[PDB]
Amino acid sequence: TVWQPLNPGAGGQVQDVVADPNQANVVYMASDMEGVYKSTNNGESWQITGNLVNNRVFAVAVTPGNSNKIFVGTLYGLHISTNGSNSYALVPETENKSIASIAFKPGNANHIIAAPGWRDDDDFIGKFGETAAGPGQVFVSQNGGSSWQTVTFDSNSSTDRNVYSVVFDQSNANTVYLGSNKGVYKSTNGGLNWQRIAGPDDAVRPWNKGIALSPNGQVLYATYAEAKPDLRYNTNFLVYATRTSNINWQQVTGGLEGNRRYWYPEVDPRSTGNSHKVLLGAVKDRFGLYEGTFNWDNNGNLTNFYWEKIWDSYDGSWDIGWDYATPPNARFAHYTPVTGGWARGVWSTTNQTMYYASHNSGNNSYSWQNKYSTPTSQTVNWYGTEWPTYKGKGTESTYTYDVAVHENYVIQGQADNGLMESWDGGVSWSNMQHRRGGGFNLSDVQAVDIADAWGVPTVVAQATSGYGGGAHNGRLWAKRLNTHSPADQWVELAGGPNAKAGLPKGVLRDVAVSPANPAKVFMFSSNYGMYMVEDIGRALDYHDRGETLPVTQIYEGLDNSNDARIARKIAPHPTNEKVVFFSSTGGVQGVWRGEQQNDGSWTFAQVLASSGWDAEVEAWAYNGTVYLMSFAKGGGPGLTDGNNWQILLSTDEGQNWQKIFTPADAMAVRPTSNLVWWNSVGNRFKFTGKGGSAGAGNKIVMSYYDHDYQLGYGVFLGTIQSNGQVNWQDITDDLHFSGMTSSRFIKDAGQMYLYSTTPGAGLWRRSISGMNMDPA
Amino acid sequence: AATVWQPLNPGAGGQVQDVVADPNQANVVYMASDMEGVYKSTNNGESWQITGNLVNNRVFAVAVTPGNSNKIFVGTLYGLHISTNGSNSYALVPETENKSIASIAFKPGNANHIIAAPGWRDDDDFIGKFGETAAGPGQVFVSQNGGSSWQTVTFDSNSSTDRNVYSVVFDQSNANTVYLGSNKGVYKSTNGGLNWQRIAGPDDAVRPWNKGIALSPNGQVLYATYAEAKPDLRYNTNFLVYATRTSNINWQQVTGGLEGNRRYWYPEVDPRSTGNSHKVLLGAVKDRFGLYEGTFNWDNNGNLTNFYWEKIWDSYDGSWDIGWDYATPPNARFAHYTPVTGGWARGVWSTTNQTMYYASHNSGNNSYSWQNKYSTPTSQTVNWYGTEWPTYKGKGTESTYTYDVAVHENYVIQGQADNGLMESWDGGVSWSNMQHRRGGGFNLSDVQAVDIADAWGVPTVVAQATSGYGGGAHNGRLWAKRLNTHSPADQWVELAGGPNAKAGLPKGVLRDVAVSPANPAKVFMFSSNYGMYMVEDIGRALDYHDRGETLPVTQIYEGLDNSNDARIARKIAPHPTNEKVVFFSSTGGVQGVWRGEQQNDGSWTFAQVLASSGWDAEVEAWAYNGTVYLMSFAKGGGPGLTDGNNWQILLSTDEGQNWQKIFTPADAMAVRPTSNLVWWNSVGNRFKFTGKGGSAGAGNKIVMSYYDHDYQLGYGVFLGTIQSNGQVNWQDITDDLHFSGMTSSRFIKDAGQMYLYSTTPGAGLWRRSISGMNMDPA
Ligand SMILES: [Cl-]
Ligand SMILES: [Cl-]
Ligand SMILES: [Zn+2]
Ligand SMILES: [Zn+2]
Ligand SMILES: [Zn+2]
Ligand SMILES: [Zn+2]
Ligand SMILES: [Zn+2]
Ligand SMILES: [Zn+2]
Q1: How far is CA B364 from CA B269, B296, B311, B338, B676, in A?
Q2: If you write DSSP's letter for every residue of B24-38 in order, what string do you get?
Q3: Where are the alpha helices (DSSP H) in B156-296?
Q4: Residue B186 lies in domain
Q5: Cβ contact (<8 Å) for B777 and A750?
Q6: Around Cβ A491, how many Cβ atoms within 10 Å?
Q7: Which helix or strand (DSSP H or E) is residue A764 part of?
């Protein structure tokens, strides 16, 4: 172990949790950014599995009778493992074909169906050139996955082809149904020829959103929806049942909440008779989880049915973990298998989490268990209630923008989850303080830093509302670390919807404290300009009186042809508080330098004609030399190399630059033999990044990453030698998701570390050896 | 050039002997300390600078030659020194070698006629350090050549009697007239000092000893104080003040208006009183009453028309800056008018005892404005006793006996004698000790040990702190200050000890208190002549204290047993990674390095592991690169290790089972040749290679300091580096540290740089940057 994770567990949208039918307590989890995790203790702890070509996983299936053979459906196609998920290989027939369901023929594990699909991730189906519209197809293997046949069930190239489920008749293994936006289809020869099943009301709601079939094969359950381009605005899915011997649908929503996106129904494999247990959650909607009971008679008539919430709002009966997400959005839900020694239970989620319910057949009760985070003995106070801090169970799937550390305190600023805070060095966390009174949540935190309020170390943060990275505005908050404990509180200083302190509403893509005067804080409001808090102690003095001290505007950026309009990273000068650098990503791009004059006025100018949306600049001092380091595209004549991002270095504050790292350097230090995905999607890979470069003392770090495909090439550490040259080494090591949004060199407990945040796998740190620092 | 050793002190803090104005240059003054030699200032005390190296640093007198401000005489316990470069360097006068001198006086009109008088002020407990005795013949060294040679003039033949001379004063109106004031009595010469004979005092039956004389500038009136002939000043408290004309010996007591029963001494006439009205300045030794100025109006027939005494300095009332040393009323143990030459204005130089103070004079008012000339107030305040007191940074002198130091972030504490808890919140620049004054006459003036503990995650100062002056600590008390804010708002609370044995901790002084590095909530302490005790968790002890309750300490070792037990600890060294193991250096009962090991049942077994000895012997235990080091600074050690009374550095890497010599006096003399010591040729034959402590170990670094407290001689500070083959290579790091004897040293990282913090038995706290140090990450 080299890279050390510091996360509270999970935190990203979970696609599925799949049980191994051959052995109780063995489960796999499909993440949308880090691939597949495995557990052999029913989710008490999770371990990463082998490397996939694409990490956006929609389906995992374990071969009945062979736990070593596992199939994984990803956005780029099907993978097969023959060593129990230790290693994976892309299946050539399905390359560039997103797969989201995998089903085995009952009694013949060599007969497999893998169906094109992508769950609700319509936003991502085009990342590799696919479209939602196309012929309706499935892939069928009859030799256990060595070869696959392409079967067409609909030939309309202009209609949505997403398949949501494939389900076999347990009582007649050659009968199989599929549920698709194309409709529900049936095959009586194992999936080689299909016929369409008419829906309950195809003129109005033709799209199927999942089917279920009773084990005796006699009853089909389905939900149906109107045709609309985006699930965001398609809210009412209705639930129906029909006998399969004569298609005649009846609506069976009596007892369900109205106007919900019910999907992926599923019959308990234990329902072998005329009473069927049907598990029903939904995409997006938060209502917990339903179990329905349908009592048919032997005439094929439904005597009665009833839906029961077996999971509901937070009420004290289950540990919600750190992710206070109530009611649960049960975006997947499965009964446990009847094989392998499994007990009867339910696997589900609150959306970003993993939950397992055990079942009491005496009183038909469910007991929900947190399978993503572990509470510690530390407590935080919020809503007048005490909540534990939580340490991860082995997974981490958060989009983390930035990180700051002071003594025992760590904060990572995340998308979706906002202010993620730790008071034990990053072992356990809580983000409860981001849920503010008045009904708004500080769910997007793009920058954090540590300032100085009259000698008291004070966290500063760009913290605003908005999910999925859709930050609403620039908004500056501060937390005085009086106790380095959960008792410390956040207060708002500037920005927000109310334009507090005269700070405009443009997002502060970075907030930076001056190392020379840590009371002074710089921030760049997107499309407005660069602003400054001269002394944060004075700003808090006004705040404590119920007043507000205005911020100072030091640069105006409102002209696209002449001004820098957006900044990604601000680098104050390490020793001169009247000089700052920033990387401009809007208007006139590149590294900009500003200098304050005696009358307090500033002059700004471009010092490197670079570009790139996530371009960074860093300035530090080491043994008498001030280094200026740019990670970006371009640079001008003699430096630009197409759209390749490069590391450029200057020792004279940006008047002269030297190219010290390129993609060719990266490939020589870390050959493409190290990348499982090079042969298949290397022709698409672009040498860019999400950020994550840093410099301190004699060390420099960077990471090549292409967010278009969630592909990370590697992490590279450079050592500045006594003569000026930089020698580079590969420090990727065991970091499996290596793209980086930010990196900082941080000394903790007398040892120098590299703290790095990732756009999908949270926070990691790594020991750095042989480092020299200036005494500071 | 530049500086290496960096002082961190509030200013002065030790008994001040004198402040002498340069008559040739206004605002030029010299200060006589008893352990730092002579300080100089050219801005009338706004800032002080060190001067040249003396052979002995107990200075009793300083005099600048009239007409040549570059020739300066300095009287010390070992004799007169002479500088010809304005105090930059000194040479010891050979005729006065081993002769304590406390008075130097020049002849008016001819500065080549000088008188140097044997003396030692009130330092009767120090006159014997180099073999001298208080009893002896009354004698005086006189020179007619400006200092080339000195002849010994005897004015009393009795060797049964005390010969201390207090003052020597010429007659400004006829330069060959001069008097001296001595425990012999008042003697007068019309010779310029070649023959003398005794003047009868006012009542030699009861009070034969004169404690200083003063002569009016016209030579016509003499003032004096006379004392009983009792040696110990603690039981001789009633000095009486008299006046006589010099035409007829006819003493008149002139105490009316003075406080009764005071040790009045060193009277002085304002050189401006050239007529028949005299202003007389009068302070005292020990007694605290401020400072008197007396006015004597004589008429030409020769009688005292009238006289009155007025307090020109008094109890603190807010009208003068008392500085950090809340010492009120002032004990004006010296007081001098400013000269009339050199452009000086009229003023008074004096002290509250450990300080330096200057008063300016308003003539159209007869008011004095007292100015703090030892420390500088900052803008930080300490709230105490309904008043907000500034913190104070030093003006260039430091004279405190400091036992120990502890640092956490911006907070620094010096544990001192006399001045108790000396605390800083800006890294040691400025200080306050006001919190040691607890009220009701209960002052924590002696703090022999400090450390930083951990109370539920909050760093917490722990201290042995008790009443008593001059190092006479009354008992052991454990105090704790939680550093909630690292600011003067943090407060001390007493956890255990005292005369009522709070928490079951007995009354013996906790000569050391040490926190376990493996578990910083656990604190060890050794109560002198009782044993070793433990606070298992200081947070839990504070939980009880905050409820108005007390959690008992734990006894882990009885030290009641003279022939079997260790009974006094000088330093406790808890094991760096195993909280069940503790070492300490025993300096009472069975001496040496002892090791205690906690067993399964919770009991402890202790045993001696080195047969060392020494009152200030130290032990240090630390870890570096997989080795646990145990280092002793002491004499002895047993067969193969003992070498007479020489202190040595012994090292062990197996918890004291086997030891090796790694530094000896021979190694020190090779690394730092005696060529570096100005005192070697005079008193080097007396120097013993001992120490007051100040050894330390951390990472690949070991430090020690050779120092003989019997003569206040420091040989040097030595730093050893642990090579990868296990051997230690030593270097001299004395550099500009002029007082280099040490009571404690700690290696401390501050803002990314390793520093050595060392406290000294007389010059406060100093720190030095340490290069090439490597630590285990922790
Ligand atoms: Cl219904
Ligand atoms: Cl001493
Ligand atoms: Zn998704
Ligand atoms: Zn940032
Ligand atoms: Zn004295
Ligand atoms: Zn100590
Ligand atoms: Zn308690
Ligand atoms: Zn005993």
Answers
A1: 20, 19, 18, 18, 55
A2: TSTT-EEEE-SSS-E
A3: none
A4: 5-376
A5: yes
A6: 14
A7: strand A762-767
Query: Residue A666 is inside which H or E element, if any?
Result: helix A663-669
**Among A30, A49, A140, which Cα is nearest to A94's?**
A140
Beta bridge partners of residue A302, listed in sequence order: A296
Ligand 2 center from residue B58 Cα (angstroms): 12
Backbone angles phi, psi at B674, to 5 degrees: -60, -15
Neighbours of B529 (CB within 10 A): 17
Say if A751 is an interface residue toward chain B (CB within 8 Å).
yes
Gap between the Cα atoms of A144 and A69, Å rounded? 9
Query: Any CB–CB contact under 8 A between A750 and chain B?
Result: yes
Tell me how far apart the terminal alpha carbons of chain A are, to the nearest angstrom: 31
Ligand closest to A200 (CA) is 1
Give the pair of three-digit tokens for residue A503. Answer: 């700070």
What residue ranges in B485-626 does DSSP mark as E strands?
A: 492-497, 510-515, 523-527, 531-535, 554-558, 566-574, 581-589, 592-598, 604-624
**Cβ count near B600 (within 10 Å):** 6
Closest listed residue to residue A580, CA positions, set A628, A624, A538: A628
Q: Output phi, psi for A123, to 5 deg.
A: -65, -20
8 Å CB contact between A135 and A116: no
Q: Identify whether the C-beta of residue B179 lies closer than 8 Å to the C-beta of residue B193.
A: no
| Cα–Cα distance measured from residue B192 to residue B113, given in angstroms and rounded to the nearest whole number | 8
Q: Which chain B residue shows the shortest CA-CA distance from A482?
A: B485
- CA of B541 from ligand 7 middle (Å) equals 8
Experimentally, the structure was elucidated by X-ray
- Contact A664/B at CB under 8 A: no
CB of A438 less than 8 A from some CB of B: no
Token representation of residue A760: 């999908």
Instruction: Tell me how far apart the alpha carbons of residues B327 and A572 are, in angstroms, rounded to a whole number.
Output: 49
**Number of Cα atoms under 13 Å in the Cβ half of residue A32:** 20
How far CA B238 is from CA of B164, B284, B319, in Å, comes to 19, 11, 30
**Which of helix, strand or coil describes residue A540?**
helix
Q: Which amino acid is at A493?
A: L
Distance from CA of B627 to the nearest CA of A (A): 18
Give the A:B interface size as CB pairs under 8 Å.
Answer: 17
**Residue A205: closest CA among A253, A254, A169:** A253
- Give the C-alpha separation, A94 to A116, whole Å: 9
Query: Which of A408, A749, A775 is opposite residue B752, by nearest beta carbon?
Result: A775
Structure tokens at A281: 């959650």
Alpha carbons B412 and B8: distance in angstroms, whole number: 10
A775 touches chain B (CB under 8 A): yes
Contact B777/A at CB under 8 A: yes
Element holding A183 (H helix, E strand)? strand A183-187
Cβ atoms of A579 and A653 within 8 Å: the answer is yes
Note whether B751 contacts A455, CB cutoff 8 Å: no
Tokens 């913090």 sit on residue: B757
Give the burial class of A596: count Cβ atoms within 10 A of its Cβ; 0-12 exposed, 13-18 middle, 19 or more buried: middle
Chain A contact set for B752 (CB, 8 A): 773-776
Give the CATH number, domain containing residue A321.
2.130.10.10
Residues of B in contact with A378 (CB under 8 A): none
Place of tokens 């900052």: B378
Q: Which long-range contacts does A440-443 make (Cβ < 8 Å, 24+ apart)?
A: A440/A465, A441/A465, A442/A418, A442/A475, A442/A477, A442/A490, A443/A415, A443/A416, A443/A417, A443/A418, A443/A467
Residue owning tokens 């070792």: B557
Residues in chain B whose C lies over 2.5 Å from the next residue's N (breaks after): none
